[PDB]
């Protein structure tokens, strides 16, 4: 029912800096139906930027909302994203909640960006109640401390390593592995 | 909480290893050869490594992409040595969790043991 979008910025925010907000990024996104969603502007940076005291606010802010939302997507540079995720990972052993990182290789101003897809992605986990820290993208979600950045200029940037892809939007559905 | 991550490659000495713990670095992650590679002659790395083990935590993942790290079967030398293996950890994981571990704790008998158990399912163990 309800969900929590934490923006850091990232090339889905540009016009790497996060010019646009977050709820701004959903919106030129395409995700339109979305009022029972709420939204903060924790970072607006290039992610090539992301220190670790960066990572103790967004899980100092990720505790403040875990018993407040259903679900919580924090978007992000896509270079970091896998450290962020990691990190989050072990500072919120075991969270109540699906807690879904993801980003874009292309800005979503752009009309090939793969933003859209992410997006939807990360809703219809977040939405899904199977707790966790998580990474979406191209369609797949991947357990947040089994994820890696493994193309620079593919669609298809993240894997999970030595793990198994954790669900996939197909269509409007999500099929868990 | 500040940590090293260096991958080993042919012609690499101990030297920049004394070095960052002479730099008040926390913490060093070697990406090694395949399952866990650690050069024992023609190389003081096994050597100073065996020094520095017992002062910070040094950590072993490879440089490959897919399959942990397995120093029990090179290996069993290195953990000899102090070296801490990551397992099937990821890099991102691997560098993230000695972090985490290293504001809580500076004991390397301690880092070892919690580098080596399963927290949040980054690791097989």
């Known amino acids: 029912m309800k969900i929590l979008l934490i923006g850091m910025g990232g090339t889905i925010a540009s016009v790497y800096e996060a010019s646009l907000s977050v709820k701004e990024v959903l919106d030129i996104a395409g995700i339109k139906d979305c009022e029972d969603c709420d939204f903060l502007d924790l970072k607006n940076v290039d992610s090539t930027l992301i220190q670790p005291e960066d990572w103790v606010d967004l899980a100092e802010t990720l505790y403040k909302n875990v018993k407040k939302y259903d679900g919580i997507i924090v978007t992000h540079g896509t270079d970091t994203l896998a450290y962020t995720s990691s990190m989050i990972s072990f500072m919120l052993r075991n969270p109540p909640i699906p807690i879904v990182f993801t980003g874009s290789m292309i800005p979503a101003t752009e009309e090939n960006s793969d933003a859209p897809l992410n997006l939807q992605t990360a809703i219809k986990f977040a939405t899904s109640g199977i707790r966790g820290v998580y990474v979406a993208f191209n369609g797949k979600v991947m357990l947040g401390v089994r994820t890696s950045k493994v193309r620079t200029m593919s669609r298809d940037a993240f894997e999970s390593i030595n793990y198994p892809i954790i669900a996939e939007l197909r269509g409007e559905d999500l099929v868990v592995n | ?125």
């Open chain 2, 1 to 125: 909480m500040a940590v090293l991550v260096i991958k080993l490659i042919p012609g690499l000495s101990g030297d920049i290893f004394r070095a960052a713990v002479e730099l008040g670095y926390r913490g060093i992650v070697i990406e090694g050869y395949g399952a866990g590679g650690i050069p024992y002659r023609g190389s003081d790395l096994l050597q100073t490594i065996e020094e520095l083990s017992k002062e910070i935590p040094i950590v072993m993942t490879t440089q490959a992409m897919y399959d942990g790290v397995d120093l029990t079967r090179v290996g069993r030398l290195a953990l000899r040595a102090g070296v801490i293996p990551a397992g099937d950890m990821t890099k991102e994981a691997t560098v993230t969790k000695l972090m985490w571990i290293l504001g809580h704790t500076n004991n390397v008998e301690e880092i070892k043991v919690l580098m080596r158990k399963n927290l949040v399912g980054e690791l097989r163990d």
